[PDB]
Design an enzyme around this catalytic site. Structure first.
Site, PDB file in Angstrom:
ATOM      1  CG  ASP A 190      18.716 -22.189  25.460  1.00 37.07           C
ATOM      2  OD1 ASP A 190      17.962 -21.449  25.548  1.00 37.07           O
ATOM      3  OD2 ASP A 190      18.479 -22.674  24.186  1.00 37.07           O
ATOM      4  NE  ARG A 223      15.379 -21.360  23.550  1.00 37.63           N
ATOM      5  CZ  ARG A 223      15.424 -20.734  24.010  1.00 37.63           C
ATOM      6  NH1 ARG A 223      13.901 -19.830  24.327  1.00 37.63           N
ATOM      7  NH2 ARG A 223      16.644 -19.314  24.161  1.00 37.63           N
ATOM      8  CG  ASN A 224      15.982 -25.379  25.133  1.00 43.50           C
ATOM      9  OD1 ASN A 224      15.636 -25.502  24.063  1.00 43.50           O
ATOM     10  ND2 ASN A 224      16.389 -24.440  25.250  1.00 43.50           N
ATOM     11  CG  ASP A 226      16.990 -28.361  23.047  1.00 44.59           C
ATOM     12  OD1 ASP A 226      16.832 -27.756  22.779  1.00 44.59           O
ATOM     13  OD2 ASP A 226      18.719 -28.663  23.074  1.00 44.59           O
TER      14      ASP A 226
END
Ligand SMILES: COc1cc2c(nc1OC)c(-c1cc3c(Cl)ccnc3[nH]1)cn2C
Length: 289
Positions: free
Chosen positions: A145, A149-150, A163
């Site tokens: 992923d 966002r991470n 993340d």
């Protein structure tokens, strides 16, 4: 458990940062968690009293993974506090928040103090993310992923991978799938390889070039699912450096075996990174040299 655990009395919460997946993330100070450092500003990941379990284990394990990692371009874990009151974990403070948030902020639409990135500042940005991925894969890891966002951004603008919710070993699922960041094979056969991580890197590069805009606007996840499995691809952002877009397309070769490797990606841009890379980066390190 054991070892990484640190005294709860050594962690004091200053102010709140923002709600996180499991619980409100805080910012504070940790006593003796870094060599030569009496006190260190850190980020405190906590969990709500709600999930008294069936998740509190999930939380501490996501951090257990981080234990294995130790790279300049991967948020460092500076201790965990399991057995006790609010189960929490403390790690390297990234004052500027996630890359997606940081990029969104640079957009004029929300008038500023920082101008959008420069083709240079974007390469540096791509290269840092890549170094961390290169390191993750090197230790036999897959992120599953990778997306703006991470990725976290440090006060000094260093971007790192911070993340690891889906990050598993090469070897239920409460929540949507990162459809828009997923490769064709990942979408089709549930396959996840270092190669798919690359496919996602590409999307990250698109995010940077569009300031974290929504990939495939107009299409729903399902449509994306289809579109992408048929060889569909995101267009070239407005005013995107020929260089950057070329790197995207490279990461999106339909054939997982034709895509470049993270090490390969770094090398194609090493000549344009910022001097200091040669030191701190995993790439030039002796653990891969
Ligand atoms: C208000 O929204 C937020 C604003 C934030 C952060 N998080 C938010 O939401 C969670 C962080 C932040 C989260 C984090 C983590 Cl999980 C690990 C390591 N360092 C970290 N820094 C910095 N700012 C300014």
């Amino acid at each position: 458990p054991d070892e990484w655990e640190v005294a709860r009395e050594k962690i004091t919460m200053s102010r709140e940062l923002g709600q996180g997946s499991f619980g409100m993330v805080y910012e504070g100070v940790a006593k003796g968690v870094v060599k030569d450092e009496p006190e260190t500003r850190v980020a405190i990941k906590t969990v709500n009293e709600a999930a008294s379990m069936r998740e509190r284990i999930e939380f501490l394990n996501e951090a257990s993974v981080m234990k294995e990692f130790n790279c300049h371009h991967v948020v460092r874990l500076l201790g965990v506090v399991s057995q006790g009151q609010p189960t929490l974990v403390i790690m390297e403070l990234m004052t500027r928040g996630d890359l997606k948030s940081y990029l969104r902020s640079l957009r004029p639409e929300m008038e500023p103090v920082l101008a959008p990135p420069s083709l240079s500042k974007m390469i540096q940005m791509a290269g840092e993310i890549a170094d961390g991925m290169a390191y993750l894969n090197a230790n036999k890891f897959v992120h599953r992923d990778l997306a703006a966002r991470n990725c976290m951004v440090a006060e000094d603008f260093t971007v790192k991978i911070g993340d690891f919710g889906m990050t598993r070993d090469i070897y239920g699922g409460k929540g949507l799938l990162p459809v828009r960041w997923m490769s064709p094979e990942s979408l089709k056969d549930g396959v996840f390889t270092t190669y798919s991580d690359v496919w996602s890197f590409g999307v990250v590069l698109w995010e940077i070039a569009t300031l974290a805009e929504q990939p495939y606007q107009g299409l729903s996840n399902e449509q994306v699912l289809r579109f992408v499995m048929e060889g569909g691809l995101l267009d070239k952002p407005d005013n995107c450096p020929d260089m950057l877009f070329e790197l995207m397309r490279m990461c999106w070769q339909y054939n997982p075996k034709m895509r470049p490797s993270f090490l390969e990606i770094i090398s194609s841009i090493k000549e344009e990174m910022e001097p200091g890379f040669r030191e701190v980066s995993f790439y030039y390190s002796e653990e891969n040299k």
